[PDB]
Amino acid sequence: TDFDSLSGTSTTWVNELGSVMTIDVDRKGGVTGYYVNNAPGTGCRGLPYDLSGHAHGSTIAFSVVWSNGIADCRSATSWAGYARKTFGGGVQIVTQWSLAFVGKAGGKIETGQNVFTYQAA
């Protein structure tokens, strides 16, 4: 049951920093939906943000720009990951992210691991 199995479904996922995204995969592989950041010590929290990417086979890549006309953290994030089933029936998306912002001293780029865990209705 790897990514093809989400052709035309909403699915919600949640990471270890509390951030929650709901992604809409279409038959052609295209990902869209909203990302809600709750990672401590960060901006643009508790508000949904347009994400967009593309899943195929066992891999998904997706991107959030942290601007939505409500709060603008002047920065963008992209995740790349692989779907992985968990002991008991569950599934995760293990990912690496990169985060580009620009401040006073010019541009910076943080990177980290993010493991998203399927949540059911």
Binding footprint of ligand BTN on the chain (CB under 6 A): 15, 17, 19, 37, 39, 42-44, 66, 73, 75, 77, 97, 99, 101, 112, 114
N-to-C CA span, the chain: 18
Query: Nearer Cβ to a second copy, position 111 or 121?
Result: 111
User: Using CA atoms, how far apart are residues 63 and 53, in angstroms rounded to an integer?
Assistant: 6
Least separation in angstroms between residue 71's CB and a second copy is 12
The answer to whether 31 and 62 are in contact (CB under 8 A) is yes
| Contacts to a second copy by CB under 8 A | 1, 29-30, 50, 52-67, 72, 74-84, 94-102, 106-109, 111
